[PDB]
């Protein structure tokens, strides 16, 4: 895999070249969302209100990404009903405020559904 490891980098360097050049907002959002540690946990669902797990690593990302019960991601609209914490322990919206930040278990994990 050693020489394979060189042809490996060439293909997926080239891929993110062809992705930066695609210049989609949805692609460029999920790509750069993931660069600061905010990555999907399952495939993005396009279907009507199917399951979407994403990882949020810090409150900064949080108050950058969460509008009440609505979390914007992937140039789409997402509706939540499951936010757990690092110790797989469920949290609540109100509890993720600017006033509770340092006590909580980052990263958090939101579960989401496509919005009508």
């Amino acid at each position: 895999e050693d020489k394979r490891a060189k042809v490996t980098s060439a293909m997926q360097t080239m891929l993110f070249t062809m992705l930066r050049k695609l210049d989609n907002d949805a692609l460029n959002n999920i790509i750069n969302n993931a660069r600061d540690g905010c990555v999907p946990l399952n495939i993005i669902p396009l279907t009507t209100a199917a399951k979407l797990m994403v990882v949020i690593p810090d409150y900064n990302t949080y108050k950058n990404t969460c509008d009440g019960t609505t979390f914007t991601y992937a140039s789409a609209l997402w509706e939540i009903q499951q936010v757990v914490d690092a110790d797989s322990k469920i949290v609540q919206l109100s509890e993720i405020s600017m006033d509770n930040s340092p006590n909580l278990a980052w990263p958090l994990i939101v579960t989401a559904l496509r919005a009508n």
Binding site: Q12, A26, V39
Partner: peptide, 28 residues
């Protein structure tokens, strides 16, 4: 086409060790 394209790529980004995007991006 972009809607399926966004889903497809979600897979590569969901693989915690498939590749380090920071170090790929830092390589660019």
């Amino acid at each position: 086409a972009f809607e399926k394209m966004v889903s497809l790529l979600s897979v590569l980004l969901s693989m915690q060790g498939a590749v380090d995007i920071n170090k790929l991006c830092e390589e660019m």
